[PDB]
Amino acid sequence: IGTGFPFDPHYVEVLGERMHYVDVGPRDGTPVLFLHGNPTSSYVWRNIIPHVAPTHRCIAPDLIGMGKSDKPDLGYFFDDHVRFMDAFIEALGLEEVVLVIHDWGSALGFHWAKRNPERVKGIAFMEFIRPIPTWDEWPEFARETFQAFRTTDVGRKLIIDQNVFIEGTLPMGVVRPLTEVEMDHYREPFLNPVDREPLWRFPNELPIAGEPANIVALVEEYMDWLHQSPVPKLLFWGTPGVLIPPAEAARLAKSLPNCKAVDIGPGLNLLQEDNPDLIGSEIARWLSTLEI
Ligand SMILES: *CCCCCCOCCOCCNC(=O)c1ccc(C(=O)O)c(-c2c3ccc(=[N+](C)C)cc-3oc3cc(N(C)C)ccc23)c1
Numbered sequence: 694i695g696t697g698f699p700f701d702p703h704y705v706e707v708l709g710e711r712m713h714y715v716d717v718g719p720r721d722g723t724p725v726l727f728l729h730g731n732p733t734s735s736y737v738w739r740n741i742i743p744h745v746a747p748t749h750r751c752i753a754p755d756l757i758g759m760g761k762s763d764k765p766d767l768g769y770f771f772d773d774h775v776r777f778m779d780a781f782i783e784a785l786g787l788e789e790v791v792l793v794i795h796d797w798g799s800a801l802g803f804h805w806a807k808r809n810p811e812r813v814k815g816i817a818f819m820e821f822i823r824p825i826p827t828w829d830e831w832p833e834f835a836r837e838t839f840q841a842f843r844t845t846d847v848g849r850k851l852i853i854d855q856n857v858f859i860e861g862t863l864p865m866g867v868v869r870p871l872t873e874v875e876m877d878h879y880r881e882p883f884l885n886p887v888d889r890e891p892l893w894r895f896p897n898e899l900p901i902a903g904e905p906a907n908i909v910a911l912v913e914e915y916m917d918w919l920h921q922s923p924v925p926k927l928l929f930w931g932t933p934g935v936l937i938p939p940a941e942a943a944r945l946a947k948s949l950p951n952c953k954a955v956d957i958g959p960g961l962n963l964l965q966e967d968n969p970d971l972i973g974s975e976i977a978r979w980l981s982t983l984e985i
């Protein structure tokens with residue numbers, strides 16, 4: 694499994710800030726837009742892109758506050774990410790896209806697609822944001838720790854002051870051990886404790902047991918859109934999962950129109966880090982089939 698990130702940095706000014714993005718592959722045709730989540734960056738896609746890039750343009754931004762993108766003194770609410778991602782997509786002139794999305798990047802991508810349904814030609818997704826109706830549907834092993842994260846004093850202490858989302862949660866979201874290079878590359882954006890705001894606001898945004906009500910609503914709205922859309926869909930899932938347990942993956946593979954579902958083997962949240970070969974191969978192949 695490659696630890697390298699052999700992509701030249703590109704930057705675009707967005708709302709007066711700058712965002713970093715990978716942009717590889719051919720200049721024409723429909724681009725594939727890869728959206729990471731918490732607490733990753735475009736780095737999470739490094740072993741998936743090289744399988745897609747021979748045939749398609751691959752664009753992988755770092756969310757505002759993350760990666761190599763700028764770090765303005767925001768609250769990094771989901772609304773903030775929405776604003777910056779809408780503006781990134783316009784600043785690059787993108788017209789139609791294929792979306793490849795994960796964790797909070799999935800809330801972004803689905804919320805975009807709902808609002809711009811004529812510009813979305815396919816969606817591949819994995820470990821994605823859906824409403825978690827009660828805390829019982831959060832996995833038991835991570836339950837206590839996510840509940841602590843969703844406080845101000847204790848959660849900030851953990852995420853911001855002790856860097857637990859990077860040091861603890863991130864390796865607990867991958868079945869294989871991450872290597873020290875890997876860990877250092879995920880550490881890099883968050884060396885300064887003050888830059889850890891998004892790492893804490895994210896889990897506080899998770900739509901769990903009805904809260905926060907605004908996020909619950911928005912997520913329900915794009916899940917309804919999704920259930921009704923004929924757009925081609927590709928769902929990766931793993932066992933036991935985190936956000937998407939196998940039973941849920943099986944239900945969505947039948948409930949969503951035009952949905953192909955692919956089991957990656959063992960997986961928790963960062964499926965890309967457990968089976969990037971399968972994921973990149975199956976995306977490249979599926980992309981071919983969107984023309985058939
Ligand atoms: C969009 C959703 C994203 C989900 C992201 C990944 O998924 C969630 C899986 O949740 C795990 C939640 N639990 C913890 O973060 C946690 C609990 C207990 C302990 C612990 O060590 O007591 C840690 C922990 C570590 C666990 C594993 C680990 N590995 C596999 C190398 C390393 C750990 O290191 C630390 C370090 C600290 N510090 C104070 C620095 C604290 C806890 C751990 C995590």
Ligand SMILES: [Cl-]
Pocket residue numbers: 731895896897899
């Ligand atoms: Cl999160």
